[PDB]
Paper text:
The fold is composed of an eightfold repeat of βα‐units, with eight parallel β‐strands forming a circular sheet in the core that is surrounded by the eight α‐helices. The design called sTIM11 is a monomeric and stable protein that with its X‐ray structure provides a suitable starting point for further enzyme design approaches. With its compact structure it does however lack an extended surface or pocket as usually found in enzymes. Here we took steps towards the goal of diversifying de novo TIM barrel by extending sTIM11 by a simple structural element, namely an additional helix that we inserted in a loop at the upper part of the barrel.
Numbering used by the authors: 1 to 190
């Protein structure tokens, strides 16, 4: 629900968070979240066609940290061309053309100015290996909050510099933040 999701952004802003993220398929929803305190606007392209047009509008509106969630490297490339600077990928990307072709293609983009790769997983080893191969942002997606907070904590101890965590509940996001997460993704897509 849009109203409740926006409220999560607002409460996190009131708590002092400065790297709030917001995930939606709709640029108008993302623009409102931006107004309310979200700095990272995640365009959800997971089941949509030409979702890079959402990136185009957000670019026009003046947002500077637009992310694009896709496991299709050609689609991520087009999103980058349309103004996305954070490319959010997962294990599903290595599905097609095995031998890191997809990963390697997103790595070519990472060499383009401030372009960053974010890798999401619910699996610790997956996340660690993605970090080793050059992921800039590590999104802890385990739904066992106990396991997720242990992973946020260990990433901090191991020196990961941009740990992210996703929830539909600002209270969980605040707990992740306290434990070392810097990027707090409000995600009411479910
Ligand atoms: Cl995401």
């Amino acid at each position: 629900d849009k109203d409740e999701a926006w409220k999560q952004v607002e409460q996190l802003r009131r708590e002092g968070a400065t790297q709030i993220a917001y995930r939606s398929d709709d640029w108008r929803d993302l623009k409102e979240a931006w107004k309310k305190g979200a700095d990272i606007l995640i365009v959800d392209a997971t089941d949509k066609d030409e979702a890079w047009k959402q990136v185009e509008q957000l670019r026009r509106e003046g947002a500077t940290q637009i992310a694009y969630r896709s496991d299709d490297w050609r689609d991520l490339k087009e999103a980058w061309k349309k103004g996305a600077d954070i490319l959010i990928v997962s294990e599903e990307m290595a599905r097609h053309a095995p031998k890191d072709e997809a990963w390697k293609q997103v790595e070519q983009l990472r060499r383009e100015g401030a372009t960053q790769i974010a890798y999401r997983s619910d699996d610790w080893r997956d996340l660690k290996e993605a970090w080793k191969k050059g992921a800039d942002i590590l999104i802890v997606d385990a739904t066992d909050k106990d396991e997720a907070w242990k992973q946020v904590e260990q990433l901090r101890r191991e020196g990961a510099t941009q740990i992210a965590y996703r929830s539909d509940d600002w209270r969980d996001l605040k707990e992740a933040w306290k434990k070392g997460a810097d990027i707090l993704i409000v995600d009411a897509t479910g």
